[PDB]
Design a protein around this ligand. Sequence first.
Ligand SMILES: CCCCCCCCCCCCCC(=O)O
Length: 162
Amino acid sequence: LIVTQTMKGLDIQKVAGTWYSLAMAASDISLLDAQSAPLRVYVEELKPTPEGDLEILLQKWENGECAQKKIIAEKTKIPAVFKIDALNENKVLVLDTDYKKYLLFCMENSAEPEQSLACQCLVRTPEVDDEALEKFDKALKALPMHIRLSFNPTQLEEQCHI
Ligand SMILES: CCCCCCCCCCCCCC(=O)O
């Protein structure tokens, strides 16, 4: 009744650097349909703060404009799962990553989430890496997704992806 798959041995210090949202999938169309939807977030980079926590700088369409956005993902007992401030706990779990080339993550609710959830295939360079997109699918095969987006190299370079 949640997201089952996670990353064991997650060194959140080897995940740091630049990242590109190549694909995103949500359990509901409304979460990802328009540019203004809430979990239509593009990911600039991950900064692992000294003391574990992860800092995301990201891009969203908020009104009219691609706004940069800094967010703080707070480590939990489980290396792969982090927590975002706050209203009702938004948890991020890292499904999979090879650190160097791709990263699979999902965000859901601690309510819990029957059954709302956004996921993303972060990559390092602006390229269609199909061997991570294949991994994105097979980890979404295990889940209730009703929208998948994916982007090109040219949209991977603009802010909010054109
Ligand atoms: C391992 C970390 C992967 C990157 C996680 C970033 C996702 C957090 C986005 C939270 C949504 C921001 C907009 C909002 O709160 O309305």
